[PDB]
Amino acid sequence: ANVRLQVEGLSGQLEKNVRAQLSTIESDEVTPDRRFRARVDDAIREGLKALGYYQPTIEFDLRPPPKKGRQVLIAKVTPGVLEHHHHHH
Numbered sequence: 001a002n003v004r005l006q007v008e009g010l011s012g013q014l015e016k017n018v019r020a021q022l023s024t025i026e027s028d029e030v031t032p033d034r035r036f037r038a039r040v041d042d043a044i045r046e047g048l049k050a051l052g053y054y055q056p057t058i059e060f061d062l063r064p065p066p067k068k069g070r071q072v073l074i075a076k077v078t079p080g081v082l083e084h085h086h087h088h089h
Contacts, residue, residue: 002069003027009041009077009081010048011088016042017047018077027073040075052082 005022007015021043026036037060044058056079066072 001029002066003029003071004066004069006074007044007077009058014051014053015081017051018044018075020063021047022075025073027071029070030083032071032073033072040073044075044077048077048079052075052084053079054081055079 005025005027007018007022010018021040025043027033030036035089040060041058043057045053048056048058056077058075058077060076061074063072063074
C-alpha cells in the first residue's frame, strides 16, 4: 500500500508530470524487476516526452526498506534538451 517513487531531475510541470506517472506505475504492490524498471522509465519518459523531453535517460535505485513506506524506488532523469523553458535554467 505505502508506495511513493522518488523523482530526480525535474521541475515545474516536468516534476509534476513524472509524479503523475509515478502514481500510475506498477509500484502499487507488485514484483519489481527488469520489466518493472521499464514500466517506470516509459511512464516518466512518456510524460517527460510531452513536457519538453523526447527520451530522457531515467535510471532507478530500488530500496525494499523505505523510511516511511513499504517499498521505495528512486528515479533520476537525464535527457539533455527541453522545449519551452521560459525561466529557471
